[PDB]
Amino acid sequence: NQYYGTGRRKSSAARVFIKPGNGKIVINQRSLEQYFGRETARMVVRQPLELVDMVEKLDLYITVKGGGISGQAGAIRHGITRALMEYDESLRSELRKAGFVTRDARQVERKKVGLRKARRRPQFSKR
Amino acid sequence: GQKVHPNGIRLGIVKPWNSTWFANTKEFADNLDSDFKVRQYLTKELAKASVSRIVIERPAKSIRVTIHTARPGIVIGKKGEDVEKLRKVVADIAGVPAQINIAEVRKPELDAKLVADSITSQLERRVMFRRAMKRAVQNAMRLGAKGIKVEVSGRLGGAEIARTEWYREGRVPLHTLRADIDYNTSEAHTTYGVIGVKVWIFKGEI
C-alpha cells in the first residue's frame, strides 16, 4: 500500500504518499518542475531520495499548503523522510545522520512592543 | 509602579473572574457599563455591610449578582427587605430582572478587600497607622494564612513627606502564578489627602 509521511516546515504542512514505482513526483497535481521554479527547491525535495539512492524505485504523490517556496520544499522533504522511514525503518539512521529526520522548529519570531521588528529596535539617540 | 496586578496575572490560572457572562461586541460595552453601575451602587449602599467581592452573571436576559460579605444578616436584613429593595434597584439599572444571591465570607480577616477596608476605616478614624497594619497582619496569621503583606502609602500621620510603610509576615510569593494570592486595595480619605492601602494575602498554592 501507501507509506505516508507528514512534513512541516515554517508554517507549511506537506502530505507525502510514497509507492513502489518507476520514479515520478507529482506535488499539488503538478510535477516537481511545474511547481517549484526554484532550483534549490528542486534539490530539497530530492535530498532524501538521492541520499537513500531510491530516487527511481519510488513514486511520490505529495500535497502541501501554507508557507512559501522554501517552506513548502522543506516541509515536503521532511514528509518524504517520515514516509521513507515508514517504508523502511532501518533507513532512519542514515536519514538522521543527514539531518532530515529532525523537524526544523525555526519559526517567525513575533513582533514585540516597542520594537520595529522581532529584534530591530528604533534608532537610539543619546541626547 | 512596577508590579503586575496579582489578581489579573492569575485570572486564568487560579483566580476566577468577577464577571462571568458572554456577549458579542454589540452589547459587550453595555453589559460592561451596567456591571460597573451595579457594582458602584452596591458598594455605596453596602459600605457598612462588609462586602468583599461582587460577582455578576448574566444568563439569558437576566442579571445574577452574588454579593460576598462577612455580614450577610445586615445585607439581608429583616425577612430580606434590604436584598429585595437591592434586587429592585439592581434590576432597574441593569435593565433586566435581577437575582441577588448572598455569599458569606467565613473569616473577614483573611479577605484582602475586607482587611484593606478595615485599615482604611481605621486610618479615617485617625488610628495610628502602624498599629492598624500590625493588627491586620497578626489577625490574618493567627486565623491561618501562609503569609500576608500590608502596604500603606501617603501622608502617614499627616506627615508632609509621603512615604510607604509595609509589613510582611510569612510567605507572599508573587512570582508564583500557582500561588493563590488574594490582593486588593483601598484608599483612606484623611484630612491630609488620600492614603493608599494594599493587602496581599497568601493562602497556599494550587
Binding site: - | W17, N18, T25, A29, L32, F36, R39
Partner: protein, 101 residues
C-alpha cells in the same frame, strides 16, 4: 473630562437619534441619481443643513463611559485604555486576561 464635556456628548447622542430618520431620507435624495430632480436635490442639501449640527453622527466623539476620556478609547469595551486595564486586572471583563504568544 469636565462635566460640561460629558453633557455635550449626551446631548449630541440625543440629537443624532432624534433626527436620524430625517437625515437618512434627506441624504437619500441627494445621493440618488435616477430619481434626482436638480431642484429636488437642491432643497435637500438646503434642508439638511437646517437641522442642528449635533444631529450628525460624525459630531459624536465617543468617550470612556466611566471617565469621559476622548482618547485611547476602545469600541469593544466603551472605556479608555486606562479604565480597561484596571477593570481587566480586577477581573471585571469576562474572559479578558493578559496575552502571550
Amino acid at each position: 473630562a469636565k462635566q460640561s464635556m460629558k453633557a455635550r456628548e449626551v446631548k449630541r447622542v440625543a440629537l443624532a437619534d432624534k433626527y436620524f430618520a430625517k437625515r437618512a431620507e434627506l441624504k437619500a435624495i441627494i445621493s440618488d441619481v435616477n430619481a434626482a430632480s436638480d431642484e429636488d436635490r437642491w432643497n435637500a442639501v438646503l434642508k439638511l443643513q437646517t437641522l442642528p449640527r449635533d444631529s450628525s453622527p460624525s459630531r459624536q466623539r465617543n468617550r470612556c463611559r466611566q471617565t469621559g476620556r476622548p482618547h485611547g478609547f476602545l469600541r469593544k469595551f466603551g472605556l479608555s485604555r486606562i479604565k480597561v486595564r484596571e477593570a481587566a486586572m480586577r477581573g471585571e471583563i469576562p474572559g479578558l486576561k493578559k496575552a502571550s504568544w
